[PDB]
């Protein structure tokens, strides 16, 4: 009651929602991307606040501290476990939902932009395009991802071999800390500014907006999507790909999608068919690429084409807040440093992907720019030596049909253990997986030991520095969730 009274004093009441408010269910649901987490059995926030100004965010945080009510911040809602809007066990929290803070101001000549955290990637990309057809920003593939959680967790996509992760192309931030104080790079200092860019969402404060550098792309890029069934030699071809792809020139990224005994090789090339064709013949002739496979288009057009296969609907695909796609979904990830034996590829394609509840596997090759950054230079540690990332994705569409896919996800993770990274078994923070471990809270503070279990998987050798930084900027563990960085204090 007191917390709400505090809010009402400082924030316009139309931006405040209690469980009894008529619009609360729609506001809560508007960016829930996973039908597992929308149902009434999920733990719901006591209040939702939808700020439109940074002062609203500061007021909310100050009220939360004064009245000891914690806040989960939501930008795009894509968190794989829903931790921006639900808790795992009953507890009291408010959501600060940034969807109304969505401006993207592009300075084409300076090659910089300020992007509000509540913008979706498609809106960021589109605003860049409105400024220039030859500038880009290296972030994720799905247009509805929110900037805030994505950049906080790193963020990577079809430009990762060329320009690395989104967070290493951030040049400043505007951030509200656990005391309600407004910060930028300068006031924050090296440790906090290091941590916020890739050290995972929530833990390091609410980022209001991010300043990014914008990077050149050619006026024409080329996409291909070439599929090979096992009868067409998919096993031999993917066995070659895992060595070749991470060594290809930085201008060429060939990811793979597999969902049965067939692999689809999806390439983005920063160039034309005319130069791609001989490059493929020289470096990866096994795929059988020829000019009929080329799809030349602008960089901006590549975003809907890669994710959706659409050629013809730029604005509709990039400016989309309908939230129409809400699978029940489970996700896991792995990193690979040593090539799989051919027999493992045989089993993945012919056996694991033909089981009940089997998902899809996405393979993204590293090397080049992403792998050139030292492991400790940012919190994202999956760099030198990485051949590829694997994402294991399970979608289903009926409420009572979770058993088979959930079982498959666990079973394949067990099967893959000998072949992927170990000690620790690395995973990508933005492919959030609660089964990697969760925090224990003692005396109202997440324990260091519990955080380390999953934390070393996402952040490797960077976990301790993250936790020491957390201890400096949020010693009472105000901004937390079940898998946020615990404070390590003296
Ligand atoms: C749904 C979805 C996710 C994808 C997709 N493809 C991806 C890709 O091509 N590359 C990637 O690198 N990642 C991809 N992912 C995963 C997303 O990157 C993650 O799911 C992001 O974390 C999502 O960000 P957002 O949509 O903002 O999600 P939220 O649930 O709001 O937040 C996640 C996490 O971060 C905290 N947080 C939110 N907002 C902030 C701010 N402003 N400051 C600090 N922390 C913040 C939340 O509390 C939560 O913990 C493709 C698809 C379809
Ligand atoms: Na290891
Ligand atoms: Na999960």
Domain boundary among the residues 374, 390, 423 is at: 423
Domain boundary among the residues 392, 423, 454 is at: 423
Residue 83, ligand 1, Cβ within 6 A: yes
Check whether residue 106 and residue 198 sit in a common domain.
Answer: yes
Report how far residue 364's alpha carbon sits from residue 64's, in angstroms, rounded to the nearest whole number.
Answer: 41
Report how far residue 483's alpha carbon sits from residue 462's, in angstroms, rounded to the nearest whole number.
Answer: 16
User: Experimental method used, please?
Assistant: X-ray
Whose tokens are 């394609």? That residue is 349
Straight-line distance from the first to the last Cα atom of the chain, in angstroms, rounded to the nearest whole number = 35
Read off the CATH number of the domain in which 191 is found.
3.30.465.10
CA 285 to chain centroid, in Å, comes to 33
Check whether residue 228 and residue 311 sit in a common domain.
Answer: no
Report how far residue 243's alpha carbon sits from residue 289's, in angstroms, rounded to the nearest whole number.
Answer: 18
Report how far residue 379's alpha carbon sits from residue 484's, in angstroms, rounded to the nearest whole number.
Answer: 14
Check whether residue 286 and residue 314 sit in a common domain.
Answer: no
Supply 92's token pair. 């009291």
Which residue of 36, 78, 141 sits with most ligand 1 atoms within 8 Å of its CB, as the best mutation to test the pocket? 78
Resolution (A): 1.4
239-271: buried (b, 16+ CB within 10 Å) or exposed (e) per residue?
bbbbeebbebebbbbbbbbbeebbbebbbbbbb
Check whether residue 350 and residue 265 sit in a common domain.
Answer: yes
Q: What single DSSP character describes residue 437?
A: -
For residue 338, which ligand has an atom nearest its CA?
2
The set of residues, in sequence order, having a beta carbon less than 8 Å from that of 359 and lying 6+ positions away, is 259, 330, 392, 393, 394, 395, 405, 408, 409, 412
Domain range for residue 34?
Answer: 1-101
Q: Which of 52, 144, 61, 54 is nearest to 95 (CA)?
A: 61
Whether cis (ω within 30° of 0) applies to the bond prior to 424 is yes
Check whether residue 107 and residue 59 sit in a common domain.
Answer: no
Residue 79, ligand 1, Cβ within 6 A: yes
Supply 372's token pair. 């050139």
Domain count of the fold of the chain: 3
Whose tokens are 């006031």? That residue is 187
Read off the CATH number of the domain in which 26 is found.
3.30.43.10
Residue 78, ligand 1, Cβ within 6 A: yes
CA 104 to chain centroid, in Å, comes to 19
- DSSP codes joined into one string, 265-287: EEEEESS-HHHHHHHHHHH-GGG
Based on C-alpha coordinates, what's the Rg of the chain?
22
Query: Which CB contacts under 8 angstroms, 24+ apart, belong to 9-12?
Result: 10/56, 10/59, 10/62, 10/63, 11/49, 11/51, 11/56, 11/59, 11/60, 12/56
Report how far residue 116's alpha carbon sits from residue 148's, in angstroms, rounded to the nearest whole number.
Answer: 8
Q: What is the helix (H) or strand (E) element at residue 364, kind and residue range?
A: strand 360-365
Check whether residue 337 and residue 316 sit in a common domain.
Answer: no
Read off the CATH number of the domain in which 224 is found.
3.40.462.20
The set of residues, in sequence order, having a beta carbon less than 8 Å from that of 450 and lying 6+ positions away, is 437, 438, 439, 440, 486
Check whether residue 208 and residue 65 sit in a common domain.
Answer: no
Q: Which of 359, 335, 163, 343 is nearest to 257 (CA)?
A: 359
Check whether residue 334 and residue 241 sit in a common domain.
Answer: yes
For residue 148, which ligand has an atom nearest its CA?
1
Q: What is the helix (H) or strand (E) element at residue 329, kind and residue range?
A: strand 328-336
Residue 76, ligand 1, Cβ within 6 A: yes
Domain boundary among the residues 423, 453, 477 is at: 423
Q: Which of 146, 23, 41 is nearest to 86 (CA)?
A: 41
Check whether residue 482 and residue 374 sit in a common domain.
Answer: no
Check whether residue 208 and residue 311 sit in a common domain.
Answer: yes
Check whether residue 59 and residue 35 sit in a common domain.
Answer: yes
Nearest-atom number in ligand 1 for the CA of 72 is: 48
For residue 82, which ligand has an atom nearest its CA?
1
Check whether residue 88 and residue 182 sit in a common domain.
Answer: no
């Amino acid at each position: 009651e007191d917390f709400l009274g505090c809010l009402v004093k400082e924030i316009p009441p139309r931006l405040l929602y209690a469980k009894s408010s008529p619009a609360y269910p729609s506001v809560l649901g508007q960016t829930i991307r996973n039908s597992r987490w929308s149902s009434p059995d999920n733990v719901k926030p006591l209040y939702i606040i939808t700020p439109t100004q940074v002062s609203h965010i500061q007021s909310a945080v100050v009220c939360g501290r004064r009245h000891t009510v914690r806040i989960r911040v939501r930008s795009g809602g894509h968190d794989y476990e829903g931790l921006s809007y639900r808790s795992l066990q009953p507890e009291t929290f408010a959501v600060v939902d940034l969807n109304k803070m969505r401006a993207v101001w592009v300075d084409g000549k300076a090659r910089t932009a300020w992007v509000d955290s509540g913008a979706q990637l498609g809106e960021l990309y589109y605003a860049i395009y409105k400024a220039s057809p030859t500038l880009a920003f290296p972030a994720g593939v799905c247009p509805t991802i929110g900037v805030g959680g994505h950049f906080a967790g790193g963020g990577f996509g079809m430009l990762l071999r060329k320009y690395g992760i989104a967070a290493e192309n951030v040049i400043d931030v505007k951030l509200v800390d656990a005391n309600g104080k407004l910060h930028d790079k300068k006031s924050m200092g090296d440790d906090h500014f290091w941590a916020v860019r890739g050290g995972g969402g929530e833990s390091f404060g609410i980022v209001v907006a991010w300043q990014v550098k914008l990077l050149p792309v050619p006026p024409t890029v080329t996409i291909f999507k070439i599929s090979k069934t096992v009868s067409e030699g998919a096993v031999d071809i993917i066995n070659k790909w895992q060595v070749v792809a991470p060594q290809l020139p930085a201008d060429l990224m060939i990811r793979i999608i597999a969902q049965g005994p067939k692999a689809t090789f999806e390439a983005m090339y920063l160039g034309t068919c005319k130069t791609l064709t001989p490059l493929m013949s020289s470096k990866f002739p096994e795929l059988g690429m020829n000019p009929s496979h080329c799809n030349e288009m602008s960089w901006i057009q590549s975003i809907p084409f890669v994710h959706l296969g659409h050629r013809d609907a730029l604005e509709d695909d990039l400016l989309n807040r309908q939230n129409s796609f809400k699978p029940f979904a489970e996700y896991k990830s792995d990193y690979v440093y040593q090539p799989f034996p051919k027999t493992v590829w045989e089993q993945i394609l012919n056996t694991w992907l033909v089981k009940p509840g089997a998902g899809i596997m996405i393979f993204d090759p590293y090397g080049a720019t992403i792998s050139a950054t030292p492991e400790s230079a940012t919190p994202f540690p999956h760099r030198k030596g990485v051949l590829f990332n694997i994402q294991y994705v399970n979608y289903w569409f009926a409420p009572g049909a979770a058993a088979a896919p959930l079982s498959w996800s666990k079973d394949i993770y067990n099967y893959m253990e000998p072949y992927v990274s170990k000690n620790p078994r690395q995973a990508y923070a933005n492919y959030r997986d609660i089964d990697l471990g969760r925090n224990e809270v003692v005396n109202d503070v997440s324990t260091y030991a519990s955080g380390k279990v999953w934390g070393q998987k996402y952040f490797k050798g960077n976990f301790e520095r993250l936790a020491i930084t957390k201890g400096k900027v949020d010693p009472t563990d105000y901004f937390r969730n079940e898998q946020s960085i615990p404070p390590l204090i003296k």
